[PDB]
Design a binder for this molecule. Structure first.
Ligand SMILES: [Ca+2]
Ligand SMILES: [Ca+2]
Ligand SMILES: [Ca+2]
Ligand SMILES: [Ca+2]
Ligand SMILES: [Ca+2]
Ligand SMILES: [Ca+2]
Ligand SMILES: [Ca+2]
Ligand SMILES: [Ca+2]
Ligand SMILES: [Ca+2]
Ligand SMILES: [Ca+2]
Ligand SMILES: [Ca+2]
Ligand SMILES: [Ca+2]
Ligand SMILES: [Ca+2]
Ligand SMILES: [Ca+2]
Ligand SMILES: [Ca+2]
Ligand SMILES: [Ca+2]
Ligand SMILES: [Ca+2]
Ligand SMILES: [Ca+2]
Ligand SMILES: [Ca+2]
Ligand SMILES: [Ca+2]
Ligand SMILES: [Ca+2]
Ligand SMILES: [Ca+2]
Lengths: 210, 211, 196, 210, 211, 196
C-alpha cells in the first residue's frame, strides 16, 4: 500500500519501459536510462550557463531533468514527430497523464511527502532558465538516440525525421549560452563523424540552422 | 504510402509488449497476444457452432486478428482501474480512434482505405462475434496473469488483473462459450500442480460467489 | 490432462520456438508472431482476390493461415512424424466433441484451392520480409540472400493469382526502393527471378 | 577526439555495463539505471533532511549521486561483499580507477571543462551530509536490487549476503534523519512483503539492527 | 566449498561479456571466447606438430581453456593503452593473481587446490604452449574486432584493437603457427567481400610494413 | 573459399545455436558455451581419474570434449546426414594437409576408452546442471525434470568409473542440498535412479 518503499520499488520498473518501441533499433534505451542521460546533459548545460554569468537554481535544474519522464510508468508518451496525433489529441493525452499522476500520488505516497512529489512530478518545461535547460536536454538526448541509430546503419527514415525535429526544437532555444555552445562545438563533432557526410544530416542541419 | 509499409509494420508489433513496467517472468508481444486471442476466438466459434448458433467467421477472425493493431501508435491500459478512471479510459479511446483514422488516411492506399477502416474499428460490439472477441481477450489476460501468479510473482497487480478478467468473463455466462469455459476449462486451470499454494482457489470461489 | 486448457497453454509455447534457429540475426521472430503476420498478409490478399472478382471462403483463408504452423510445437519422413504427433496430441488433449474440427484445423493447408494458394504465398511473403529485414540491417550471413531468392522464386510460381500480380506490381518495387538496397544483390536477383 | 560530443556519446555506453555480472538475475540493471535510481533515492533523502531542519547543498547532493559510477565505463567495481578481495587489494583498484579517470579527462574533455569534470568524477562519499546521503543511497539501491532477486525466488545465497552487508552499512549511518526514517517506515514495508517471513531476512535484520 | 560450486560457476562465465560499454553488433561471453581460443590453439598445435615440433597437449589445452576463468571475479582490460598505462595493467595483474589464490583457497577442496593453482596461473609464459596461448587470444581479438569493422561499427576503438592484435601476432613470426597465419589465413580475411570499403587493407599493409 | 579462416569464422557461428531450442527458459546456453563447460568438466574428471591411479591420455580427453558438438553447425538417419555434412565440410574448407586431423577431431568421440567415457559423463553432467538450473529458478516445464532424470540415469550407467563415484559421493549431494530443492521431486527421483 501507501509508502516510500513502493516508490523505491517503482524506480526499477522504469528499466522495463523502453523509448519509442516498435521500430527496430540496434540499441534500445529504457526510460530510466534516458532520464540518467537527460540529467547528465542538463548538468553540463548548467555549467555552461554559469560560465556565461547566469545564476542557476541547481535543485530546479536537477529535479526537472531527473523526474520528467517518471509518469511513463503509467502512461506512454509519443517521441516521434506529429503524424497521426494532432495538437488537440496530444493535449488530451497530457490531461490523462496529469490526472493519473495525481491519482498515483494520492494512492502511493504518504501524505507527509505528497507535496514534494506533486512538485517533483509536475510539468518541468517552462520559460525559466532551468525549464529551458530541460527542454533542450531532452531534445539533445533524442538527437543522440536518433543519430546513433543512423550512424549504425539503421535503415528506417523515421530516425532522420526525429533528428530533424529534435534539432529544429533545439534551434528555437538559440538565445541560450547552452545552445550557442552546442551549435558551435558539439554539433560539428557529430557531423564530422565518419560516413555522416554520405547521409542527409549535413544538408538537413544547414536547412534547419540557416 | 503503400501495403509494403503496412507489411513491415506487422513486425513492429513484435517489439511492443503488453503492460510494460512491472516485472514479469514472461513477456508477450502484441503480435503474440493477437495470435493467441485469434486462436481462442476460433475455439469459441467452434463452441457456438456446436450449440447451433450461426457464426460469421469472417467477422470473428477479423475482429480477433486486428483488435490490437493500433498499439503500434498508442498504448492501451491492460491493468484494472488504479490511476485511470472510467472517464480517463474513454478519452484514451477517442485518441486511439482518431489516430487510427489518420493512420489509414496516410499509410494505406485509397482503394483499400475502406476495408482497413472496417478491419481496424472497435471490434467489441454486441454481435455474437464481438462478444467472442470480448471474452477471448479476457481469457488471454487471465492466462497471462495466471501464469505470473503460478510463478509466485510478487506483484499484487497480477491477482487484480486475474480477478477483473474472470469477473468480466462471468458477465457473459449466458453464452455457450462461457458456459463451456467455466464448466471445463477453469477447473483444469485450478487443478494445476502447485496452485493450492496460491490464493487462486479461494479467489476464484469468491469471484464466482460474487458473480 | 485431456482438455482445452492444455491447448490454450500450448498457444504460449509457440512464443518460445523461433524462426531460423541457429543463425545470427538482429531480430528473432517466434512461430506465434510468424503466424500472426502470415494471417494478416493472407487477410490482405483475400481483399485483393475479392476486388479481382474472385469468391473467397474467408473461414478457409483464416483457418489455413492461423493454424498452419501450430504443429511446430512437435517437430519427407519428418512430415510423417509431425503428422503422427499431431494425431496423438489430438486424441490425448482435445475433447472428443472437438477432435474432428481440430484434426481439420491442424492438417496441411497448402492445397490448390484459392485459400490454400493464399496460404502458400502469404507464408513466403513473410519469409521474404524476414530475410529482407536482416539484409537491410546489414546481416552479413549470405543464407538470407539465398532465403530471399527461394521465397521470391516460390512466390513467382503463383504468378497466375491476382494476389501475386498486385505484389509484383505494387509491393515488391517499394521493397526494392528502400534506402541502401542498391548496395546489395537484391535488385539483380529480383530481375533474374521474375523474368528469366 | 577531445570534445563534449564524445562525453555525450559515452552516456549511452553505461547502458551496456551491468551490475555484478555472473550470477543469474531475474532482472539485470545497467550502471546507467543504477545511477538514475541512486539519484532518485538521494533526492528523497534530501527532502527528509530538510524536513528535519538540515540545510542541504542540492548541487552537491545531485552531482555526487548522478556521477558516482560513471568511471565504470573504463574499470569495473566489486559490489559483492569481501570474499577474495582484501582491503589492500580494493585500495589498489581505487588507485587504478583514479588514474584512469584522470587520463580520461585529459584525453576526452576540452580544457575549459576539465575542472568541472575533475570535480564531478572524483570520490563523492565523505562525511559531509551530501556525501553521507550518497553513501546510504548507493546501499539502499543495492539493498533493493538484492531484495528484488530474493523476492522473485532467486536461489543464490549471494543475494542474502549482499542484502546483509548493505543493511549493515546503512545502519552505520543511523544518526541521520534519513536512516531513522528508513528504519522506521521503509524497512518494515520491505519485510512485510508476502513470503518474506519465510526467508532469512527478518532474522538477519534483527541481528544487524539490534 | 566443493566442486559443485565450481561447476555452477562455469555457467556464470556465460553472463560476463568482453569489453562491455561500446556498442558491438555481436557480444561474446567469456565462455564463448574461451571455447574459441582453445579451438584456435588446437589448430596452431597441429601446425607446430606438422612442422615437427614436440607439443605438450595437456599444457596447450589447459592454458587455453582456463586463461580467462578469473574474469568471474575481476575484469580484464581488452582494449589498447588508452587510460590504463603499462604500470596500471601490472597492478591489475597483481590483484587478479591474489584474488585467484584466495578463490582457490576458499572454494576448491583441499585435495584439488594444487591442480587448480596450476590450471589457473598465468598461461602466457615462454614455453611453446604459452606462446600458442598468446597468439590464439590475439587471433580471437582480431576476429572480434574484424567482425565489427566489417559491419562498419562507428567506434574507432575496433580499428585500434585490430591494429594492436595484428602488431602483437607479428612479434611471434618466428613460429610456424604465425608463419602459417600470415601466409594463408590473414589474406583470406582480407579477401572477404566488402572489405575493400573498409580501411583494413591499407592498415594491414601498414602494420606489416611497420613490422 | 577453402581455408582455416572459414573454420575460424565457423567457431563464432556456434554462439548462435542454442541448447534446448523451442522451450521456455530463464537462461539460454550456446553450443560454444556448452562445449566450454563440458571441456572444463572433463578436465576435472581427468584429475579424478589420475588420482585414482588411472593413466589419462590428455590430448584425447580434451580433443574429444572440445570438439564433440562442433557438428551441430550442420544438423539414426539424422546421424547419417550429420556425418555426411562433416565429411563435405572437411573436403571443401580444410586444407589437404590438415584434413586427416580434422576428420579425426570431428568424428564421434564417445567410445569405450577412458577418455570417451569421460566425454559421455561430462556431456551428461552439463545437461544435468542445465536442467537443474532451470528447475531451481522455478521453470515450470516438466520437460526439465525429465531431462534431469535421463541425464542422471545415464550418468549412473557409468558407475564403475572413479569419476562417477566422486560425483555421486561429493557433488550430487551438494546439488541436492541447494535451497528449495526439498519442494521439488529431485530428491525422490535421485534416490530412485541411483539405487533402484
Ligand atoms: Ca536492460
Ligand atoms: Ca566555472
Ligand atoms: Ca514526460
Ligand atoms: Ca517553477
Ligand atoms: Ca523525455
Ligand atoms: Ca571545435
Ligand atoms: Ca519473446
Ligand atoms: Ca485494442
Ligand atoms: Ca487486447
Ligand atoms: Ca507447418
Ligand atoms: Ca510457415
Ligand atoms: Ca537494457
Ligand atoms: Ca518540506
Ligand atoms: Ca563508483
Ligand atoms: Ca566536497
Ligand atoms: Ca554504486
Ligand atoms: Ca508504517
Ligand atoms: Ca550470446
Ligand atoms: Ca586472463
Ligand atoms: Ca583473453
Ligand atoms: Ca555431437
Ligand atoms: Ca553435447
Amino acid at each position: 500500500g501507501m509508502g516510500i518503499h513502493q516508490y523505491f520499488q517503482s524506480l526499477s520498473d522504469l528499466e522495463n519501459i523502453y523509448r519509442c518501441p516498435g521500430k527496430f533499433k540496434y540499441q534500445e534505451h529504457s526510460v530510466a536510462e534516458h532520464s540518467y542521460k537527460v540529467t547528465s546533459i542538463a548538468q553540463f548545460f548548467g555549467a555552461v550557463e554559469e560560465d556565461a554569468g547566469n545564476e542557476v537554481n541547481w535543485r530546479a535544474l536537477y529535479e526537472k531533468a531527473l523526474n520528467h519522464d517518471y509518469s511513463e510508468l503509467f502512461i506512454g508518451d509519443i517521441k516521434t514527430p506529429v503524424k497521426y496525433a494532432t495538437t488537440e489529441l496530444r493535449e488530451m493525452l497530457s490531461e490523462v497523464e496529469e490526472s493519473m499522476t495525481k491519482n498515483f500520488i494520492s494512492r502511493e505516497i504518504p501524505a507527509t511527502f505528497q507535496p514534494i512529489y506533486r512538485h517533483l512530478l509536475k510539468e518541468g518545461k517552462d520559460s525559466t532558465l532551468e525549464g529551458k535547460i530541460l527542454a533542450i536536454s531532452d531534445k539533445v538526448d533524442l538527437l543522440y538516440e536518433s543519430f546513433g541509430e543512423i550512424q549504425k546503419g539503421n535503415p528506417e527514415n523515421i530516425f532522420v525525421e526525429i533528428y530533424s525535429e529534435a534539432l529544429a526544437t533545439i534551434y528555437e532555444y538559440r538565445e541560450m549560452a547552452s545552445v550557442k555552445y552546442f551549435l558551435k562545438e558539439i554539433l560539428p563533432d557529430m557531423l564530422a563523424e565518419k560516413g555522416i557526410e554520405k547521409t542527409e544530416l549535413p544538408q538537413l542541419t544547414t536547412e534547419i540552422t540557416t
